Ligand binder design. Structure first.
Ligand SMILES: O=C(O)C[C@@H]([C@@H](O)C(=O)O)[N+](=O)[O-]
Ligand code: SF4
Length: 753
């Protein structure tokens, strides 16, 4: 066919649109109906298109991803599991991106230099494991993972998996990009088929066109308020309609990115001329030309059926700001000042932060600079503190060159290193005391309790970078940039003009400094050293195989009330220091979750001593004394980040099962991967029958089977017993993970010993 390389770094790995076409055609001969775009790319990557059972929402698909991307907070545990497998080399193109361990403190270069000293052990481990197993490595300072992927690796029709829940960002270039836990990436790097429950498809028809202050971020802030944080669970969101051509390629990536906050499996846009333009400007005109020849397979079929359809008129959309503690509490910017006032949310904005993978593009920096130059023209600077994260080294070099960085510095901003930084709590914040009630507004995507600064009383609102810039200039949530007046130096009142900016540099991008490190694909005689006394890195010891018995008289470690995100289960911020050390990071287990017994975080009754104390300490006491335990959870347990540490930590501290009203997808898959039992109530009202004092017997594990419920006997202290049924979504592949003790244990059994 054509021999067009997958990227500039892998000149030998060719795009296989011929394979894709071939597979799409096998499947449509079987289904005899129009396929959506996500169905074309997902079913086009089936390991066995001829025999795979395909029912949306019901069958598990065995897929062959094109490439794997990992960032340094999840790559450490994915590579320690890969090192346990004993396999010598990764089977598909794979990269590690170092973006999570650079703490915001001093800004830019000084923070990068410090992170390189402080995190030397970890960066060394990843570069060495990368050289040994054939994984490309983007050095600290390269940029945030999803911006490097859009710029170098994502292309129309790719199926990419990344160990990060915002991997859907790549949907802005027409690929299917899906977030997974480190153990799922091990399957694909190992070469074994990856399984994914066949998605439902929600279609979002965009009409009209964006005007003025409304930006791509407002489309997904509105969709999140409509669908709620659990409304996209088990579905791919497919954007289509005449309004699509009004959005830049990084704008489409912004909308796909935050589809993660409604629990969607991923989001995608059809190949179009804005994508083509972005591919040409990033040195991939040959890939845009090839995609032009295969265009039919890169847009939806005429008349395809969406399981749910939502229509959004871009022309009537207004600026939104979402929060404070959920990203789906959606307010128009024009009303947030009054809802805050009524609700007791602090009205002054202490810090305005632009960045994260969701909004750190060249265009986002240009639109922020366009608001800021107007303030500067009237002798104003930011009333709030203001920080700016460029998404990649290329964007940093180019916004510097094209003058936007100096405008943002002159209004009072501090440019931070090209890294997550304050978005996962890597921020040495000292303007507030812990527990001080305050408001920050960000262009990020999540605003979960204590995630940005570990202060549970910080009220964080997420919005677009141009609205963060306008609110930082005013310093108060009571400011609508569309209607209100600022007062210049000169005494005149003036109004902010809606920002206008180029979506891409007029000249070419400036690449900035060299930050990619190709594997020696020669040498690979690297020994990966993990010191046995390391506090940051620890080799894994396998979990125990299932004993063949039912689980009786299980202790409830904690019955959780309400929202319980993976940031409540395994906090980030200061704990990122231990993402390669299981025993040390297990000390944060469930410290943010609210206990229904007393409505406190990190305070549970130890059943034996009858003292209330920290959840990790109590779990370790139960483990020490042979008491097997359970967590009881409410709805959408495990919402958020893909960090498999939220599943590895309960396994390690002696947990057996997590029984909830519902689970978020990636967390439920991670629980099964680590040999725990994720179970849901067959009647959610049964959550109210279980009291923290009850003991539970899960019965029927001997004939554990797809589609058959398990019985749970609730043993009340007064002698009363009640029996309830619990559902599971295990297929026989996954029951083998549970019988072996983990998926990694099962994989190692299949290596003939
Ligand atoms: O905890 C992690 O490292 C992965 C994660 C992170 O980038 C996050 O935003 O919480 N995520 O979203 O998947
Ligand atoms: S959401 Fe924040 S922490 Fe996660 S990859 Fe994006 S910028 Fe980094």
């Amino acid at each position: 066919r054509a021999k067009v390389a997958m990227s500039h770094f892998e000149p030998h790995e060719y795009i296989r649109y011929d394979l894709l076409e071939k597979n799409i055609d096998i499947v449509r001969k079987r289904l005899n109906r129009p396929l959506t775009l996500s169905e074309k790319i997902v079913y086009g990557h089936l390991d066995d298109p001829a025999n795979q059972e395909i029912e949306r929402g019901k069958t598990y698909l065995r897929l062959r991803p094109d490439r794997v991307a990992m960032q340094d907070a999840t790559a450490q545990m994915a590579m320690l599991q890969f090192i346990s497998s004993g396999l010598p080399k990764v089977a598909v193109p794979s990269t590690i991106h170092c973006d999570h361990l650079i703490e915001a403190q001093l800004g830019g270069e000084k923070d990068l230099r410090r992170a390189k000293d402080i995190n030397q052990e970890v960066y060394n481990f990843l570069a060495t494991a990368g050289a040994k197993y054939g994984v490309g490595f983007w050095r600290p300072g390269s940029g945030i993972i999803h911006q490097i992927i859009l710029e170098n690796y994502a292309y129309p029709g790719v199926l990419l998996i990344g160990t990060d829940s915002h991997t859907p960002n790549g949907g802005g270039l027409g690929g299917i990009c899906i977030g997974v836990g480190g153990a799922d990436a091990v399957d694909v790097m190992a070469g074994i088929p990856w399984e994914l429950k066949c998605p439902k498809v929600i279609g979002v028809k965009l009409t009209g066109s964006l005007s003025g202050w409304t930006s791509p971020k407002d489309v997904i802030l509105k969709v999140a308020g409509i669908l709620t944080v659990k409304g996209g669970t088990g579905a791919i969101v497919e954007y289509h309609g005449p309004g699509v051509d009004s959005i830049s390629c990084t704008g489409m990536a912004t909308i796909c990115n935050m589809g993660a906050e409604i629990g969607a499996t991923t989001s995608v846009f059809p190949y179009n001329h804005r994508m083509k333009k972005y591919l040409s400007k990033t040195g991939r005109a040959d890939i845009a030309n090839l995609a032009d020849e295969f265009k039919d397979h890169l847009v939806p079929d005429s008349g395809c059926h969406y399981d749910q359809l939502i229509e959004i008129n871009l022309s009537e959309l207004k600026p939104h700001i979402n929060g404070p503690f959920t990203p789906d509490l959606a307010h128009p910017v024009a009303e947030v000042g009054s809802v805050a006032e009524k609700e007791g949310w602090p009205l002054d904005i202490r810090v305005g932060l632009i960045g994260s993978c969701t909004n750190s593009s060249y265009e986002d920096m240009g639109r922020s600079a366009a608001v800021a130059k107007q303030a500067l023209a009237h002798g104003l600077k930011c009333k709030s503190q203001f920080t700016i994260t460029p998404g990649s080294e290329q964007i940093r070099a180019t916004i510097e060159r094209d003058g936007y960085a100096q405008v943002l510095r002159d209004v009072g901003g501090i440019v931070l290193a090209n890294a997550c930084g304050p978005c996962i709590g890597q921020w040495d914040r000292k303007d507030i005391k812990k527990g001080e009630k305050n408001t920050i507004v960000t262009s990020y995507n999540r605003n979960f309790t204590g995630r940005n600064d570990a202060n549970p009383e910080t009220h964080a609102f997420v919005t677009s970078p141009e609205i963060v810039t306008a609110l930082a200039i005013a310093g108060t949530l009571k400011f609508n940039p569309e209607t209100d007046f600022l007062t210049g130096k000169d005494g005149k009142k003036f109004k902010l003009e809606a920002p206008d900016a180029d979506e891409l540099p007029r000249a070419e991008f400036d690449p900035g400094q060299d930050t990619y490190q190709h594997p020696p694909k020669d040498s690979s005689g690297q020994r990966v050293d993990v010191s046995p006394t390391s506090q940051r890195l620890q080799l894994l010891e396998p979990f125990d195989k299932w004993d063949g018995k039912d689980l009786e008289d299980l202790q409830i470690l904690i019955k959780v009330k309400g929202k319980c995100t993976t940031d409540h289960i395994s906090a980030a911020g200061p704990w990122l220091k231990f993402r390669g050390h299981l025993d040390n990071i297990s000390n944060n287990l469930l410290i943010g979750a609210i206990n229904s017994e007393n409505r406190k975080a990190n305070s549970v009754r130890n059943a034996v001593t009858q003292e209330f104390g920290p959840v990790p300490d109590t779990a370790r006491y139960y483990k020490q004394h042979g008491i097997r335990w359970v967590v009881i959870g409410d709805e959408n347990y495990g919402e958020g980040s893909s960090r498999e540490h939220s599943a590895l930590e309960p396994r390690f501290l002696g947990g057996r099962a997590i029984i909830t009203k519902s689970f978020a997808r990636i967390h439920e898959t991670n629980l099964k991967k680590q040999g725990l039992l994720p179970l849901t109530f067959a009647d959610p009202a049964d959550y109210n029958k279980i009291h923290p004092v009850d003991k539970l017997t899960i019965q029927g594990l001997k004939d554990f089977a797809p589609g058959k419920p398990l019985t749970c006997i609730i043993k009340h202290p007064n002698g009363t017993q009640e029996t309830i049924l619990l559902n599971h979504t295990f297929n026989e592949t996954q029951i083998e993970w549970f019988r072996a003790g983990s998926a990694l244990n099962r994989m190692k059994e299949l290596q003939q010993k």
